Design a protein around this ligand. Structure first.
Ligand SMILES: CCCCCCCCCCCCCCCCCC(=O)OC[C@H](CO[C@@H]1O[C@H](CO[C@H]2O[C@H](CO)[C@H](O)[C@H](O)[C@H]2O)[C@H](O)[C@H](O)[C@H]1O)OC(=O)CCCCCCCCCCCCCCCCC
Ligand SMILES: CCCCCCCCCCCCCCCCCC(=O)OC[C@H](CO[C@@H]1O[C@H](CO[C@H]2O[C@H](CO)[C@H](O)[C@H](O)[C@H]2O)[C@H](O)[C@H](O)[C@H]1O)OC(=O)CCCCCCCCCCCCCCCCC
Ligand code: CLA
Ligand code: CLA
Ligand code: CLA
Ligand code: CLA
Ligand SMILES: CCCCCCCCCCCCCCCCCC(=O)OC[C@H](CO[C@@H]1O[C@H](CO)[C@H](O)[C@H](O)[C@H]1O)OC(=O)CCCCCCCCCCCCCCCCC
Ligand SMILES: CCCCCCCCCCCCCCCCCC(=O)OC[C@H](CO[C@@H]1O[C@H](CO)[C@H](O)[C@H](O)[C@H]1O)OC(=O)CCCCCCCCCCCCCCCCC
Ligand SMILES: CCCCCCCCCCCCCCCC(=O)OC[C@H](COP(=O)(O)OC[C@@H](O)CO)OC(=O)CCCCCCCCCCCCCCC
Ligand SMILES: CC1=C(/C=C/C(C)=C/C=C/C(C)=C/C=C/C=C(C)/C=C/C=C(C)/C=C/C2=C(C)CCCC2(C)C)C(C)(C)CCC1
Ligand SMILES: CC1=C(/C=C/C(C)=C/C=C/C(C)=C/C=C/C=C(C)/C=C/C=C(C)/C=C/C2=C(C)CCCC2(C)C)C(C)(C)CCC1
Ligand SMILES: [Cl-]
Ligand SMILES: [Cl-]
Ligand SMILES: [Fe+2]
Ligand code: NA
Lengths: 45, 336, 58, 58, 238, 33, 37, 33, 449, 30, 61
């Protein structure tokens, strides 16, 4: 090994989320936009 | 209106007062297309050679590496990658990513997303302006063809290396190798596509000439006739009856198309349908279906093969086949 | 088709800028045909009450 | 408009410079060599199989 | 990951992780290499894994120094599956020999300023000698490109043109080196191996190696550049 | 000429004529088409 | 092939599959029968 | 490379969320008719 | 029937006159279903009549018989046809049921009530009664879930299905212990669609397939009940257009996606589409050619491990970008192929040099040669081989037919999503027939865009 | 130097497109 | 029973011909359905009887 790599290619990773930080930022961004929509529009269900 | 910032943002995004219409399809079209444009420009100008065939034989496609506009291209991804996903963060370094043809995959992906969202945006503006929403259906034909030559064919052949290079000479190379490996000229769907583009040219010239000839005299000499028409004329400035009479007398009476609506539907449907057919042909050949193969189909009484023009086409195909990738083949059958 | 492949092999007709301009002209003509047809058929005035918009024309 | 002489000269001097244009030139060469014998019978080209340009294992 | 740990894993648990390119590492051996039992052994499962590539470059002052590079060909630089012989002597003398296996790997590093340097990282027919602490030797370095390889214009040995047919008025001595001078003469490289750990019960050995071999000559077009490759090696005895 | 070919042609003619025959019968009868 | 009892009925089976494409042509015939009303 | 990956993930999630929640915010009522 | 004057739809859109005629619409849908079953039965009978069990199924251009054989029903070890009678039974049954469905469609289309709202309230939808539409969706969803559980039962307690990964050449196995783990089953849908991952197309076990169909059947029944007993949420009302053409457009988009997925499944997957019946895939054929030439040149002395190709990269074996040993040449693009005849030769780090020397069994060689000679390459007129052939072989792989046909269908049904969906939106808003010509929206907007 | 000329020509074409889009003469109704 | 099955199958084919060519005629005819309920019922009943007879004859031989 002469260098460092992600080493994720060709793996069954969900959404490519190898580390939990990616999943957390995905959830945070989606949830923030959802919160804006919910406090502006009306979602109930 | 609503004091909420989100409502203002939605109003601005869907506003029809913008010089260029952003939309909800727009918020995905703009970033993907801008990313693809940036990567394509920087790669076309200055990008190191790419090992397209995976045989450690890099191909130079950028202007900085001794290319002109005609020969320059964004070389497809390395054959070693295959259909594997190759983002920037996957590569160990930018040098490796450039070497293995990552920019091609980046541009192709962001561009496919861009064109899909462009079609959606066409529908969205049609809906916002209160018009019939079928310009996007017509635009689907170029989208179908672009998907076939950038996405579907690599998937069928198992590698992005077989996708059309983002260049001119690369395009010609793609066409020649495609003819070698699939005999596309004899495929009835490239036949329908050729009939479609030739008919598009013919009907465009015919319709434009008829409308220009039927243009009623509202402007005299000493100036261009375009001054006769006004953007708010809200009237037909051409005598449709005379044009229909001319077209009927030219070939044979009762040639139909006395409806402007029927004529324009035919103009819309001929090239669009034929391009749909040729894109489907490209995809089916991507799954190795090929055109007609009438090689040695004519034999004499004793069994000697009597050559046909299909045999000469096959000779040319053999010439292309044994040279298209000189060093990439270790076994007699391509199969890939 | 043989004629076309012969031109590619011997004359390198694809690289010739004049077939380039011809290709651009023909593809642009097809584009204009499709775009004009679709735009006219999708900006029609109502002029009728039937869902068949072809009848609403004199 | 068969060739760009600058690129041909560079490829001749540099045995590792390759573009899609050079690959197209090779394809044209293959087409000519493999179609000449039967496309132009008046030439009476009885080319042995060892002079026809050919890639590897194909 | 020792040999057993690697062997226990299935293909589906290894594909996509880059573990394949890594060579196995002895873990429960002893650093005292003099304790190995003397004899003749059939060295099999011989693997080599580089840890760095440096390219020799001579500056204005003549200071030939090795410059670090950036790899381009991903994880396709590990030699493994090699077989050979090894004679451990009582005093520690070593007669190392390599015969078969995936003993070559074509790689391409990039030099600062944007230089693509390809080379065949190989240890073919390495007939080494020396003590058990460190034994050195020479190995064959085949031509990077085979004879039948065609240059972008169709020139090449065996199958080829031997002429720049794109210039029907230029095939003269100004292009002697590029035309018909496709010299596929094999070169030689030097390597040095040091044994770090030995597991006597398993009979396996591992250590560090340093090798120097010429770069790709591009079928004799341009002079070869010296490549220095350091790394770690593993093997099993008898 | 072949018996299988003869039967194939007979079956083909029957199935082809089935549709136009019922259309014609409904037209002459006056059925609502 | 078909079981030996159904061997004589092979021509009918060889003709059957084309009926679905005959149905659309029948629809066009029916429309023509009513003057494309 | 991890920082680039997380940055791109954030950007893509932001834009896709904008798309999804913009087409939900009473879009069919945004026509002149 | 109807006319244009009373409906506004010309003959070339005549079925559009059935939008608000519930009874005749039911008749038309039942008639088309009868057509589907009739094609199934008739084509199955045609295939069995033209079938010789001596040759492989993919040699004879059969598409339905491989489908039946994958479910068991008269196949021995290695995919050998034992009884052709079950295929005949399936053909006859689908055909007779098609006759019944055709009679029903004719009745509900000609004599049955034109509108079912008055006489039969249970069947009287209104295209905007959201509760009724959800009820219909729930009924048909329950039916789909029952079908999925039917497949599960066939694989579990009714002889199992044809496992191509069984030791040897593959055989009909009774799947016990299906993969009912949530992480494994739902990891496929969130898996990437690119190479090495393949999304759900890369399903390889029969246990995974059966567990997935278990989950899908249970979820479909539960969702059918849920959509039966509930009304769409207020946010759902605003998000969607509620009309018959809108529902048609949603279904068109869904089935276009499903058609693309089926095309890729037929082209790539060899578990649910065993190569014993459908023939080799593209990757399978390429790997088979490389393997056959490797064993040929290995039998003639030589050492394929150290054999260097013209490019200096490896004539028979090389290293995948991750480091796994793989077959050399162009087939390096298909390094992620997995097949029943090549897995025994794979060690932890990919193809094993030792196993490739002596562990190769003759049946693997025979299967590899047969797959190489029957690569999925053909012409429109069914001439086997590359486009440059001698027009002597009559073969096009069934995988190629399935892939091409269902890809064309998927694309056209995507165009259907576009057309029918845009028209649904316009008709709901009111632009379906054209600009108002008295109040154009554009004339009420500020100039310069 | 040829690359410089090609880049200049492409930049000129793109600038012409930009001006024709955002600095067009307004379409005068009637 | 092979010959019996074959003649029964031919009878079923003929009855299917009659039904295919007559049921649309009876349905679309004005007042035809009401006056021909019995005929169509007899046709369908004999058609199904022939189907089941062919099935049992196939089972036997
Ligand atoms: C955007 C990128 C779309 C790529 C894609 O998706 O196209 C490819 C995927 C299928 O992916 C393939 O999936 C394959 C799964 O086969 C693997 O698993 C199989 C299981 O039987 C076999 O074992 C086989 O040998 C083994 O290779 C392989 O992983 C391939 O490398 C991989 O490319 O299509 C799919 O997921 C289905 C989606 C197709 C979308 C088509 C869009 C048209 C508009
Ligand atoms: C208008 C359409 C053309 C007129 C019909 C011509 C025709 O078709 O006639 C040809 C065939 C009949 O050919 C007969 O059947 C065979 C066809 O080959 C098949 O059978 C061979 C073995 O005999 C091999 O198994 C081979 O793999 C297999 O393809 C042989 O050619 C026989 O010699 C020949 O008599 O019609 C048929 O099969 C019936 C075809 C029915 C429709 C099938 C649609 C499948 C394709 C969908 C879209 C795919 C791709 C997109 C388009 C491109
Ligand atoms: C499988 C495709 C299909 C189906 C199921 C239908 C179904 C239907 N169409 Mg339609 N149509 C189709 C394709 C189809 N169409 C196509 C391709 C076109 C373009 C040409 C049209 C154009 C069209 C128009 C213009 C109209 C319809 C109408 C109708 C409805 C009334 C039918 C009727 O009473 O006519 C009359 C029935 C007859 C004349 C009887 C002859 C046909 C029968 C069914 C014989 C069938 C033969 C078969 C072998 C019988 C088997 C019997 C069984 C016991 C074995 C009906 C529900 C009408 C409508 O809108 O409803 C209000 C209408 O006006 N269609
Ligand atoms: C999706 C399939 C479907 C659906 C929803 C219906 C629905 C309906 N059918 Mg029908 N039918 C079908 C298929 C279907 N049918 C088939 C396949 C056949 C052939 C066996 C029939 C033959 C049939 C007859 C003979 C009659 C109905 C009748 C009815 C109505 C009476 C309700 C009832 O009692 O049950 C009802 C709206 C009755 C009717 O139409 O009332 C006048 C009736 O007489 N159906
Ligand atoms: C094909 C069958 C089917 C259909 C047509 C519908 C249709 C509908 N459902 Mg229903 N549902 C179904 C099956 C179905 N459902 C099943 C099997 C279940 C059991 C799990 C449910 C459980 C369910 C609930 C709990 C609810 C609905 C609701 C709804 C309504 C709102 C749809 C919506 O939310 O927009 C679109 C949906 C989304 C934008 C969210 C997407 C969520 C999925 C899981 C994303 C997964 C992505 C993943 C990566 C896969 C990507 C691959 C893909 C490209 C193929 C709608 C009419 C809502 C409703 O109205 O209540 C009655 C609601 O609350 N459904
Ligand atoms: C000309 C029209 C046409 C034709 C001839 C075909 C033909 C075919 N299609 Mg296709 N399709 C079409 C149009 C068409 N399609 C269109 C327009 C679309 C949308 C774009 C699709 C989308 C599509 C998909 C997604 C798939 C097919 C598939 C198939 C193949 C299998 C058919 C099948 O089994 O379906 C399905 C059968 C049913 C729905 C009924 C099954 C009912 C139960 C569950 C059966 C279970 C039996 C049970 C196990 C036995 C009893 C056991 C018991 C004793 C316990 C087949 C050759 C499949 C394929 O092979 O992929 C290539 C596939 O999955 N098609
Ligand atoms: C058909 C799609 C089936 C797959 C669905 C899940 C896709 C997925 O998980 O992607 C995951 C993939 C793969 O992600 C990659 O996976 C690799 C292998 O595991 C590595 O882990 C990489 O690090 C990882 O980035 O990401 C993508 O290819 C693109 C995802 C985002 C695309 C957004 C487009 C949104 C457009 C419209 C949205 C409308 C609403
Ligand atoms: O031996 C007769 C064989 C069964 O033979 C054996 O029988 C056993 C006991 O039942 C087991 O089922 C075994 O698995 C089976 O091999 O019959 C079959 O093979 C079944 C034929 C295939 C299933 C029916 C297909 C059509 C079914 C419904 C069509 C409906 C259409 C609605 C429209
Ligand atoms: C496979 C090919 C078969 C289907 C092809 C799909 C046709 C898509 C139209 C392409 C033209 C692009 C938009 C151009 C466009 O908008 O066309 C305008 C025109 C709109 O006409 P109308 O909307 O008045 O037609 C009545 C119904 O469509 C009511 O919506 O479209 C048609 O005429 C469709 C005719 C049916 C064709 C039957 C086949
Ligand atoms: C509505 C309408 C339509 C449609 C229709 C339809 C589509 C119907 C259905 C139909 C159908 C779909 C029917 C079915 C039929 C079938 C049958 C009636 C069957 C029979 C059988 C028999 C008789 C026997 C046979 C046999 C056996 C079983 C064994 C083997 C051999 C044989 C095959 C011989 C149209 C378009 C016209 C238009 C107008 C309206
Ligand atoms: C069976 C089986 C399995 C499993 C499978 C599964 C698990 C499935 C599921 C799947 C799923 C889970 C699916 C889902 C899907 C979803 C979707 C596809 C969605 C879409 C969305 C939409 C369509 C929406 C849109 C919109 C928005 C976004 C905005 C506004 C407007 C609207 C709302 C319209 C396996 C693998 C083992 C294989 C074998 C077999
Ligand atoms: Cl090429
Ligand atoms: Cl190869
Ligand atoms: Fe016009
Ligand atoms: Na070649």
């Amino acid at each position: 090994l002469v260098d460092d790599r992600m080493n994720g290619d060709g793996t069954g990773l969900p959404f490519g989320v190898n580390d939990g930080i990616l999943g957390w930022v995905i959830a945070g961004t989606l949830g923030t936009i959802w919160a804006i929509y919910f406090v502006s529009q009306k979602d109930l269900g | 209106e609503n004091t909420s910032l989100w409502a203002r943002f939605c109003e601005w995004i869907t506003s029809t007062e913008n010089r260029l219409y952003i939309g909800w399809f727009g918020v995905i079209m703009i970033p993907t297309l801008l990313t693809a444009i940036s990567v394509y420009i920087i790669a076309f100008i200055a990008a190191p050679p790419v090992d397209i065939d995976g045989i450690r034989e890099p191909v130079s496609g950028s202007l900085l590496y001794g290319n002109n506009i005609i020969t320059g291209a964004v070389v497809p991804t390395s054959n070693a990658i295959g259909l594997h996903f190759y983002p920037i963060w996957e590569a160990a370094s930018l040098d490796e990513w450039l070497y293995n043809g990552g920019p091609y995959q980046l541009v192709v992906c962001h561009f496919f997303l861009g064109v899909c969202c462009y079609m959606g945006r066409e529908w969205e503006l049609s809906y916002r302006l209160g018009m019939r929403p079928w310009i996007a259906v017509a635009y689907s034909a170029p989208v179908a063809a672009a998907t076939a030559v950038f996405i579907i064919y690599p998937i069928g052949q198992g590698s992005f290396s077989d996708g059309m290079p983002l260049g001119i000479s690369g395009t010609f190379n793609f066409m020649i190798v495609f003819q070698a490996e699939h005999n596309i000229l004899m495929h009835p769907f490239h036949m329908f596509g050729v009939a479609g583009v030739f008919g598009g040219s013919l009907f465009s010239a015919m319709h434009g000439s008829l409308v220009t000839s039927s243009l009623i005299r509202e402007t005299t000499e000493n100036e261009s006739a375009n001054a006769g028409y006004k953007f708010g004329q809200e009237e037909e400035t051409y005598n449709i009856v005379a044009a229909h009479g001319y077209f009927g007398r030219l070939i044979f009476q009762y040639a139909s198309f006395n409806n402007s609506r029927s004529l324009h539907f035919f103009l819309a449907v001929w090239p669009v349908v034929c391009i749909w057919l040729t894109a489907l042909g490209i995809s089916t050949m991507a799954f190795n279906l090929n055109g007609f193969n009438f090689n040695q189909s004519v034999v004499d009484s004793n069994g000697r093969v009597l050559n046909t023009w299909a045999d000469i086409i096959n000779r040319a195909n053999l010439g292309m086949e044994v040279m298209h990738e000189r060093n990439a083949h270790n076994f007699p059958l391509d199969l890939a | 088709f043989r004629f076309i492949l012969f031109f590619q092999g011997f004359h390198n007709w694809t690289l010739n800028p004049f077939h380039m301009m011809g290709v651009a002209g023909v593809l642009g003509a097809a584009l204009l045909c499709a775009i004009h047809g679709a735009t006219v058929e999708n900006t029609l005035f109502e002029d009728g009450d039937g869902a068949n918009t072809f009848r609403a024309f004199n | 408009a068969y060739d760009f002489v600058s690129q041909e000269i560079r490829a001749a001097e540099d045995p590792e410079f390759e573009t899609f244009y050079t690959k197209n030139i090779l394809l044209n060469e293959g087409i000519r060599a493999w179609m000449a014998a039967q496309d132009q019978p008046h030439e009476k080209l009885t080319l042995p199989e060892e002079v026809l340009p050919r890639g590897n294992a194909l | 990951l020792t040999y057993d740990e690697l062997q226990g894993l299935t293909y589906l648990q290894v594909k996509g992780t880059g573990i394949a390119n890594t060579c196995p590492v002895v873990e429960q051996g002893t650093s005292n290499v003099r304790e190995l039992k003397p004899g003749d052994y059939k060295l099999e499962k011989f693997c080599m894994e580089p840890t760095s590539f440096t390219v020799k470059e001579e500056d204005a002052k003549g200071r030939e120094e090795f410059v670090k590079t950036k790899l381009l060909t991903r994880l396709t630089y590990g030699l493994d599956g090699m077989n050979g012989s090894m004679k451990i002597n009582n005093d520690g003398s070593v007669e190392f020999r390599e015969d078969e296996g995936l003993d070559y790997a074509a790689t391409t590093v990039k030099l600062p300023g944007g230089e693509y340097v390809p080379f065949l990282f190989t240890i073919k027919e390495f007939d080494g000698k020396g003590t058990l602490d460190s034994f050195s030797g020479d190995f064959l370095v085949p031509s990077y490109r085979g004879s039948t390889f065609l240059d972008p214009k169709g020139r090449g040995g065996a199958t080829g043109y031997d002429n720049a047919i794109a210039l029907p008025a230029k095939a003269d001595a100004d292009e002697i080196q590029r035309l018909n001078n496709k010299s596929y003469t094999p070169g030689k490289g030097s390597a040095v191996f040091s044994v770090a750990k030995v597991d006597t019960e398993t009979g396996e050995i591992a250590g560090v190696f340093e090798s120097i071999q010429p770069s790709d000559t591009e079928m004799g077009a341009h002079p070869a550049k010296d490549i220095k490759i350091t790394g770690l090696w593993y093997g099993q005895l008898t | 000429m072949s018996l299988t070919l003869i039967l194939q042609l007979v079956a083909l003619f029957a199935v082809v004529a089935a549709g136009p025959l019922v259309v014609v019968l409904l037209s002459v009868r006056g059925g609502n088409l | 092939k078909l079981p030996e009892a159904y061997a004589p009925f092979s021509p009918i089976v060889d003709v059957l599959p084309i009926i679905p494409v005959l149905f659309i042509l029948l629809a066009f015939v029916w429309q023509a029968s009513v003057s494309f009303r | 490379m991890l920082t680039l990956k997380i940055f791109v993930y954030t950007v893509v999630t932001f834009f896709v969320g904008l798309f999804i929640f913009g087409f939900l915010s009473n879009d069919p009522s945004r026509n002149p008719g | 029937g109807r006319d244009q004057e009373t409906t506004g739809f010309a003959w070339w859109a005549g079925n559009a006159r059935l939008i608000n005629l519930s009874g005749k619409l039911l008749g038309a849908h039942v008639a088309h279903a009868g057509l589907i079953v009739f094609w199934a039965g008739a084509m199955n009978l045609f295939e069995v009549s033209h079938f010789v069990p001596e040759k492989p199924m993919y040699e004879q251009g059969l598409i339905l018989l491989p489908h039946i054989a994958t479910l068991g029903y008269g196949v021995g070890p290695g995919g050998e046809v034992l009884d052709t009678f079950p295929y005949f039974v399936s053909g006859v049954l689908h055909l007779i049921s098609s006759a019944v469905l055709g009679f029903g469609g004719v009745y509900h289309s000609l004599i049955g009530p034109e509108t079912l709202e008055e006489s039969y309230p249970f069947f009287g939808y209104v295209w905007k009664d959201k509760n009724k539409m959800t009820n219909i969706l729930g009924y048909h969803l329950i039916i789909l879930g029952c079908g999925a559980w039917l497949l599960v039962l066939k694989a579990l307690y009714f002889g199992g299905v044809y496992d191509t990964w069984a030791p040897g050449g593959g055989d009909v196995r009774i799947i016990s212990n299906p993969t009912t783990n949530a992480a494994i089953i739902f990891g496929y849908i969130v898996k990437s669609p690119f190479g090495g991952d393949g999304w759900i197309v890369s399903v390889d076990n029969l246990e995974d397939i059966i567990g997935g169909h278990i989950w899908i059947g249970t979820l479909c029944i539960l969702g059918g009940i849920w959509h039966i007993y509930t009304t769409p949420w207020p946010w759902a009302r605003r998000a969607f257009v509620w009309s018959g053409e809108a529902y048609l457009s949603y279904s068109l988009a869904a089935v276009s996606l499903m058609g693309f997925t089926a095309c890729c499944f037929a082209w790539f997957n060899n578990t649910a589409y065993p190569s014993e019946f459908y023939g080799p895939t593209g990757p399978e054929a390429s790997q088979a050619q490389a393997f056959t030439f490797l064993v040929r040149d290995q039998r003639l002395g030589a050492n394929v491990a150290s054999a260097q190709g013209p490019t200096g990269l490896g004539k028979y074996l090389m290293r995948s970008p991750t480091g796994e040993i793989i077959f050399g040449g162009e087939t390096m693009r298909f390094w992620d192929f997995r097949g029943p005849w090549v897995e025994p030769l794979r060690g932890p780090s990919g193809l094993d040099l030792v196993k490739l020397k002596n562990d190769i069994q003759p049946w693997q060689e025979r299967r590899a040669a047969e797959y190489m000679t029957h690569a999925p390459l053909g012409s429109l007129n069914s001439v086997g081989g590359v486009a440059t052939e001698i027009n002597a072989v009559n073969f096009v792989s069934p995988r190629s037919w399935l892939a091409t046909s269902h890809f064309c269908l998927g694309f056209f049904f995507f165009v259907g999503h576009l057309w029918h969906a845009g028209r649904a939106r316009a008709a709901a808003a009111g632009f379906e027939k054209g600009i108002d010509r008295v109040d154009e929206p554009v004339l009420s907007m500020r100039p310069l865009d | 130097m040829e690359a410089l000329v090609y880049t200049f020509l492409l930049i000129g074409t793109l600038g012409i497109i930009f001006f024709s889009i955002f600095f067009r003469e307004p379409p005068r109704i009637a | 029973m092979t010959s019996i099955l074959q003649i029964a199958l031919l009878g079923l084919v003929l009855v299917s011909f009659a039904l295919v060519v007559g049921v649309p005629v009876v349905f679309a005819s004005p007042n035809g359905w009401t006056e021909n309920k019995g005929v169509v019922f007899s046709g369908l009943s004999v058609w199904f009887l022939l189907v089941f007879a062919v099935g049992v004859f196939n089972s036997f031989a």
